[PDB]
Amino acid sequence: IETVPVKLKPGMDGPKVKQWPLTEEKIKALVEICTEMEKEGKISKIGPENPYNTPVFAIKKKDSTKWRKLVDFRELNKRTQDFWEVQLGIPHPAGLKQKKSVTVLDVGDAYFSVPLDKDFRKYTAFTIPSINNETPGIRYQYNVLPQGWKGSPAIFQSSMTKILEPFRKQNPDIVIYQYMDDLYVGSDLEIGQHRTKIEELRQHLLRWGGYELHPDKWTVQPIVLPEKDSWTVNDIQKLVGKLNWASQIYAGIKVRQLSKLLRGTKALTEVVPLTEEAELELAENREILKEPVHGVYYDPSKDLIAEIQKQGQGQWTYQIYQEPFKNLKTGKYARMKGAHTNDVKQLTEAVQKIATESIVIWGKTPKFKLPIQKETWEAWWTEYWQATWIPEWEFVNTPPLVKLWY
Amino acid sequence: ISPIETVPVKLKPGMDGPKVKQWPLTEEKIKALVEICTEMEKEGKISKIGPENPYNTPVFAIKKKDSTKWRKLVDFRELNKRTQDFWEVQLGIPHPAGLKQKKSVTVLDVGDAFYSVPLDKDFRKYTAFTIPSINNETPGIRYQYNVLPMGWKGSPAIMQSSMTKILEPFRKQNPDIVIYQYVDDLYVGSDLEIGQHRTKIEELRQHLLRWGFTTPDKKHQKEPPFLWMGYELHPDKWTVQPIVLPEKDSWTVNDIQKLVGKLNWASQIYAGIKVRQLSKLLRGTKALTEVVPLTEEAELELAENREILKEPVHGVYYDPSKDLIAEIQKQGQGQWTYQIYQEPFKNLKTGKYARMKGAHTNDVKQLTEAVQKIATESIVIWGKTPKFKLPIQKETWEAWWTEYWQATWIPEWEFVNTPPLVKLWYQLEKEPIIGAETFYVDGAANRETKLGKAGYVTDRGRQKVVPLTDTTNQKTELQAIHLALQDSGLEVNIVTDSQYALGIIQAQPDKSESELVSQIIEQLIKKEKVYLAWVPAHKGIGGNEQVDKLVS
DNA sequence: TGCCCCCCCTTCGGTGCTTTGCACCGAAGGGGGGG
Ligand SMILES: OC[C@H]1O[C@@](CO)(O[C@H]2O[C@H](CO)[C@@H](O)[C@H](O)[C@H]2O)[C@@H](O)[C@@H]1O
């Protein structure tokens, strides 16, 4: 087999990212996994004359107790040449988001049968740490299409479509979308039946060489106004500032009628009776709030952005957009772990669910704006990650000026 | 010299080798560098070259020790800048608290580790140096390296990784033998009785020698205490090698810098070390030779530290069959100290956390950061995370993570009553207060003039405007809140239009690098109840419109 | 008149905000310690 020639984007060098500390059980698993791929020639030991590095850790998915090696190729993928420019690219199919159920298959091991350009391998280096720094780090690089590398679904495109063809024209109304090392496969059959087309699909891939989603229940959370019999100056102040914010999103929202009931220097707890002209404004605004915003369409050439807010009692609101205030989706993620006592775990799970929805709907993950300190996130998140991909993210400290989404 | 395969190295793309002339030197150093290099040449570490090699890097002469024997080092600063980058494989420093008890212990060094590792043949011509002759009688004696030069950027990593490759056969064959390899230093522990243990030792030494690594006897420690990584390894416990702190009539900035560094080193085993007041002296200074008088707080802190240091202390070793326990105490002014142990009063090690992250913070956040520092340190040393003992109540933590909008967490912890306790110093009411005055605050500044006003109006008819000089937008808004807190009673409702000020205050800070914010904090702590509300500016709203009015 | 690594404390300069100063963060300056 002869490789596909690969380039970094012009004027960019390979990744140079430090390895972070790892627990005993993750180091042991990585050493077990990598010495076995050493033996199979999938990776090769290297030294310090290779100046590149990418962090690596491991994950146990909650119903497969095998360890899975996860290389964080986010930096490498950003510097890698576009395959869309070179014509190799995976068309996202709509109508995956309308299937009854969609199961996620980890398929990254199919890449291990295709070699990687000899001149690109050096950019895939990683380093296994050691407990108490008993030894220096141990370094490997890939000889094959690495998992988590964006170029591997693209180079392997030609082949997987041939692997998948008989299944898909023997099953025309299943829909199968490849994202990175994952296969998202949905359809409308009953779960008992849907799952065994999964397991039949499972064996067909095994013999040449998961999570259970339900897109229909992914309801939107619209912005809601409270309802009361009586209203204080503080209630009306909160309402007015919340509709004023909502005016950068929706259209023709008025606050002048509710505004002037607060004419004067009033106490916050004084109860202001609604004028009927103000019930007019509030009933009207209330249901511009009801239905989605006209004029908001997805653009595939621009990035997706996701914002999350801690609301409390296990709840988490989120909005996905590309330009500010033009939300493609607003939602509310809820804990179900039953523990109720770990904010970081809930946020990490929220991120995986939101990113999963974007893959199902648009075909790619959003860059997250996370309501958490950088160092609190980096202390704990890998303990709770279950996805073979890792989205972009950044860390924000925006106090709530409104409880807009609650 | 080892028969290990050389590591190929390159210059950065576009760059040539160094061409730095030899800074002239004494006929004495000249002749000692002759001496040094004839012996290196007979060992094959270097070889003579001539003028057809165009590269050069200066050779300077250094006294090796108190004996006066000369030592040669080559100033590869220029070649280093032109040599490729490396990925360093030394990821950290082993710590004796990470060691398990062993029956039999040995500490060995390899001799001239660097000079026993060959250098890529095509790269040697770039290590060329010239020994000059007195008054240019001759062109000079040129040489180049055949082994790893000390002072070349890639030598430590190439020696380290070569050693890892050589140790690997031996390590796999004997998995019950712990080898800590730091550069050319080897700690070797086992549970074999000293006879079988010493068999395996000379077996290891022989493996090393076949690969070109001597193990001199003067560096072969056979008996406790072992001198290792700056420590002393006894069988049941470990020790730092003695710490001598500077003692001065008159202190320079540099003296103070050296003192803080020693105290931080000591803080890994000596509990309670503090450096906040001594490091404060370093601030705003402008020369390392500038004499700095100690403040009163700095003398006290130094004396406190000196008392701690005169007591003897020891760490214990790691028992993997017991939990790790981390206990934290609060020391004041953003300083924290911790001990990690498995049985009570038997510290594996200690430490301190005293960084101020952010302009505004509180003790709960800083406690969370101390936990995070300890959690990371524990994974580096022991590969796991400790159970925590913290001086904060469950009610306090719960009130914090339910009223703070950022996700936050700390793992399994027991409350331990160790005053001073970490506490929230105030809590903003989640609803407006009945019977309390309502303040509508505002502050504006002219961006060009440096001038501003802060003021308020109330539902009880009170009003006030203060003029401000050399201020900012964000300051006048904080200033306006300062006025309302100052002129209000024990319970107050405040309405502001500055998201900035709201953001700081709703985070419940208890300390700030801003004196203005620090003033607001001391007033918040003295109130009974505070409700703080935001409204958008310039929408002619309620009281906010008339106070904005009043500002202009 | 040299090299590599970890740590802490201080200072500085780049980034983004629907800002005009502010808060954050990473790099580099000093120090400790290891080889
Ligand atoms: O958490 C940010 C932190 O992670 C690192 C890798 O250790 O960067 C990763 O995350 C960033 C945010 O998505 C990516 O831009 C980057 O490519 C990825 O490696 C650190 O660089 C960063 O400090």
Author numbering:
A (entry chain B): 5 to 213, 231 to 427
B (entry chain A): 2 to 553
Provide the authors' own sentences about this structure as they appear in the paper.
Importantly, we found that additional mutations F160M/M184V in RT rendered HIV3MB virtually fully resistant to both 3TC and ETV. To experimentally explore the structural effects of the Met184 substitution with Val/Ile, we also determined the HIV-1 RT3MB/F160M/M184V:DNA:3TC-TP ternary complex structure at a resolution of 2.57 Å. We found that two RT molecules in the asymmetric unit were in different conformations: one in a closed conformation identical to other RT3MB ternary complexes, whereas the other molecule was in an open conformation reported previously for the RTQ151M:DNA binary complex structure. The structure revealed that oxathiolane deviates from that in the RT3MB ternary complex by a maximum deviation of ~1 Å. Interestingly, the Cγ1 and Cγ2 of Val184 coincides with Cγ of Met184 in normal and backward conformations, respectively, indicating that the χ1 angle of the residue 184 side-chain is significantly restricted.
Fortunately, the RT/RH domains of HBV Pol exhibit weak sequence homology with human immunodeficiency virus type-1 (HIV-1) RT. In particular, a consensus sequence present across multiple regions (i.e., Motifs A, B, C and D) that creates a dNTP-binding site (N-site) for HBV/HIV-1 RT is significantly conserved. Here, we report the acquisition of 3TC/ETV resistance using HIV-1 with three HBV-associated amino acid substitutions (F115Y/Y116F/Q151M) in the RT N-site.
